[PDB]
Design a protein around this ligand. Structure first.
Ligand SMILES: Nc1ncnc2c1ncn2[C@@H]1O[C@H](COP(=O)(O)OP(=O)(O)O)[C@@H](O)[C@H]1O
Ligand SMILES: [Ca+2]
Length: 147
């Protein structure tokens, strides 16, 4: 299908995310793990098969639409799962990269950063819908809202 990485969702600085309305599931990787260049990507986040209870509105083995930010400190992957809310900490998750949204950019203010994040989300919805429409998949296996 798509390029992907897996690993546990871990603690970041725990500020600048949830309290601004854009919580992101942090994963970290040694830079010898293949990843795309720093930037924002449209993709799917799946909680891998597990006996662990998940708290909130995501179930294991379902691909949730995500806006994924890749950074370099060693490498980081930070996924905002669209229109969902669950405690992902400690869960083993797969992040699939579908399409490129934009290169890394710098921002004037917190407010400008949030404006761009909202644009990244809207572009993520459209790119994923275009990838759902071609390459047809079963309704039960993915989650994506148009609005
Ligand atoms: N829609 C969502 N997308 C990503 N993570 C979410 C979402 N809703 C709740 N979470 C939880 O919020 C956490 C991220 O919040 P954040 O404020 O970015 O803190 P941190 O710095 O620890 O990454 C995730 O690890 C996950 O447990
Ligand atoms: Ca985060």
């Amino acid at each position: 299908r798509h390029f992907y990485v897996t690993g546990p969702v871990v603690r970041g600085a725990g500020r600048g995310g949830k309290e601004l309305g854009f919580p992101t599931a942090n994963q970290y990787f040694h830079d010898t793990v293949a990843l795309p260049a720093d930037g924002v990507y449209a993709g799917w986040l799946t909680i891998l098969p597990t006996e662990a209870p998940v708290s909130g509105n995501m179930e294991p083995e379902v691909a949730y639409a995500a806006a994924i930010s890749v950074g370099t400190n060693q490498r980081s992957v930070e996924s905002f799962v669209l229109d969902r809310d669950a405690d992902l900490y400690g869960h083993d998750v797969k992040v699939e990269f579908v399409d490129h949204v934009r290169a890394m950019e710098k921002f004037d203010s917190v407010e400008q950063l949030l404006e761009v994040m909202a644009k990244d989300v809207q572009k993520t919805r459209t790119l994923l819908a275009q990838d759902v429409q071609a390459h047809k998949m079963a309704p039960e296996t993915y989650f994506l809202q148009a609005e």
